[PDB]
């Protein structure tokens, strides 16, 4: 909530993956001076000789950028008494550690988790290519300023795409394929050669999610499992 005469102001906090698993949970003690959010669209416009054609491909990657200053006067902390310079240095060190460890293409763990404690909204975010720009000019000598730009991956309400547990009814790991392969490994080279011959003969004679119940996709697996317990030719078929 913002200061609206009904509730007191609340200020932004950022959750980071802890390198031992779990998290760190940093928070700002003075809120941003500028706050900007962009929502670009992938729409494109092409002009044909007799008509205009409007084509859209959906939402594009959002950008979050904000700028602010760390407070001067000392302020108590939930486990210390930390000054503005220590807070800014802690921020720089978190950011440096998060950027440097990403040298394997992408962290297998968390993106940064962002809580907008001011206007109700939550995002998962990544460091933008502008990065953490820190400056301190002649004006306001004892106040630090920080500029952060981020890109939004998705809402924090939704879990990871690949991690979603699919239906997986029936059996995704059928035993028929496994024991067929074991049988065929156990066969003699001449046996497999004759099986290849029979397959080629059948192919000549062509012309001229899995569930044992209410499903036909696994029909071949039951038939392929046969022709080895029963000698349907010196070797299986298909």
């Amino acid at each position: 909530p913002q200061s609206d005469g009904i509730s007191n102001l609340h200020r932004i906090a950022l959750r980071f993956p802890k390198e031992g698993g779990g998290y760190d949970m940093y928070r700002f003690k003075v809120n941003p001076e500028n706050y900007t959010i962009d929502s670009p669209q992938r729409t494109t416009a092409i002009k044909t000789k007799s008509d205009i054609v409007i084509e859209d491909y959906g939402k594009d990657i959002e950008v979050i950028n904000f700028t602010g200053t760390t407070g001067f006067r000392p302020v108590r902390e939930a486990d210390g008494l930390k000054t503005g310079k220590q807070k800014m240095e802690e921020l720089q060190s978190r950011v440096s550690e998060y950027a440097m460890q990403g040298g394997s293409g992408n962290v297998s763990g968390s993106y940064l988790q962002f809580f907008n404690f001011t206007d109700d909204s939550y995002y998962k975010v990544h460091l933008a290519p502008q990065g953490l720009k820190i400056t301190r000019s002649k004006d306001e000598p004892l106040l630090f300023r920080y500029e952060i730009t981020l890109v939004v991956i998705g809402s924090l309400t939704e879990a990871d795409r690949s991690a979603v547990t699919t239906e997986e009814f029936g059996n995704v790991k059928p035993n028929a394929s496994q024991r067929v392969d074991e049988g065929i490994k156990e066969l003699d080279k001449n046996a497999r050669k004759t099986r290849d011959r029979n397959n080629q003969e059948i192919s000549r004679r062509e012309n001229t999610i899995y569930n044992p119940r209410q499903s036909t996709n696994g029909l071949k697996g039951n038939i392929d499992n046969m022709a080895l317990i029963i000698g349907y030719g010196d070797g299986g078929v298909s």
């Binding site: 609340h10 906090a13 779990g22 928070r27 988790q113 809580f115 404690f117 939550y122 924090l156 309400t157 939704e158 879990a159 991690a163 979603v164 547990t165 699919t166 239906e167 009814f169 209410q214 036909t216």
Partner: protein, 212 residues
């Protein structure tokens, strides 16, 4: 997958097919999906008495396929079996382990909680459809993330979250609940309706879009 429909007064059979597919001509497929005889719909309910299973009337329920499974004979066959029970094919059937909701709700995150039980006599209690979905959200969320002895990243971080009662921490509990619940494909999405921080009691209530 499918949609339900309720037959209305003097409802034209072709109007159903048009109303949900735009063309009229797919009504031949729809009536085959629902195992109807030629009298597809009838005003009088006494006429249904003669052939109840093969004759529908006002206020009866019909099954509408989605467009892709329209001409699949196998879907037509299965959709001729699961009439007004088709939900069971998507949500599934599983064993009941919630023997008393009066028990585990007062003990919460711990070892040695849930157990198999028996409804009726002799047949072990199998809990099905929406009632399977209740269990498969509840039993998931009570498990801590690391727990289960195959396929880790089950469960939730909920047991970590008993920190200070201050507002940020409450939103952190909302986030882990949302994260845990949207993790199963059977639910489209989730969002918070309301929350209430008592002196040491968190209370909050959440919507989930179960499919069908």
């Amino acid at each position: 997958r499918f949609k339900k429909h309720v037959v209305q007064h003097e409802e034209t059979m072709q109007a159903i097919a048009q109303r949900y597919y735009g063309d009229v001509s797919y009504w031949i497929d729809l009536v085959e999906h629902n195992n109807l005889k030629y009298p597809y719909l009838v005003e009088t309910d006494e006429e249904k008495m003669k052939d109840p299973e093969r004759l529908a009337s006002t206020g009866d329920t019909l099954i509408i396929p989605i467009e892709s499974d329209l001409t699949d004979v196998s879907a037509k066959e299965i959709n001729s079996r699961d009439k007004d029970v088709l939900v069971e094919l998507a949500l599934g059937r599983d064993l009941n382990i919630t023997a008393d909701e009066k028990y585990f709700n007062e003990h919460g995150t711990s070892d040695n909680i849930l157990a198999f039980s028996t409804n009726g006599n002799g047949d072990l209690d199998t809990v099905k459809g929406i009632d399977n979905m209740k269990q498969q959200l509840q039993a998931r969320l009570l498990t801590p993330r690391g727990s289960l002895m195959l396929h880790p990243n089950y469960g939730s971080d909920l047991h970590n979250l008993f920190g200070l009662n201050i507002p940020e921490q409450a939103t952190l509990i909302e986030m882990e609940v949302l994260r845990t619940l949207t993790s199963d494909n059977r639910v489209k999405s989730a969002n918070l309706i309301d929350w209430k921080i008592q002196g040491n009691v968190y209370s909050g209530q959440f919507s989930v879009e179960i499919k069908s």
